[PDB]
Design a protein around this ligand. Structure first.
Ligand code: NA
Length: 85
């Protein structure tokens, strides 16, 4: 299906990004989220899909209003497509 050339081009393009997924409990009032953030959840518990490079300074800034945290690297960091799209 995909050629070796197409695969390494894909890896070259994709590897720049480091999507992660963060589970949080806490208070989310008075927070502005970076552009890479896609925030799901309820008033006092979130799941955030975001870029690692944005997560780091965000946590340093706002981490005092979070009470529990779990961080996962998104599986797309190690995915190659089976076909093009
Ligand atoms: Na990556």
């Amino acid at each position: 299906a995909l050629t070796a050339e197409e695969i390494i081009q894909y890896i070259s393009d994709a590897k720049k990004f480091t999507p992660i997924k963060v589970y949080l409990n806490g208070n989310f009032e008075g927070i502005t989220y970076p552009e890479s953030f896609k925030v799901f959840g309820s008033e006092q518990s979130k799941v955030i899909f975001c870029e690692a490079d944005d997560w780091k300074p965000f946590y340093e800034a706002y981490g005092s209003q979070f009470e529990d945290i779990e961080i996962e690297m998104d599986r797309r960091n190690s995915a190659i497509p089976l076909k093009d799209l």
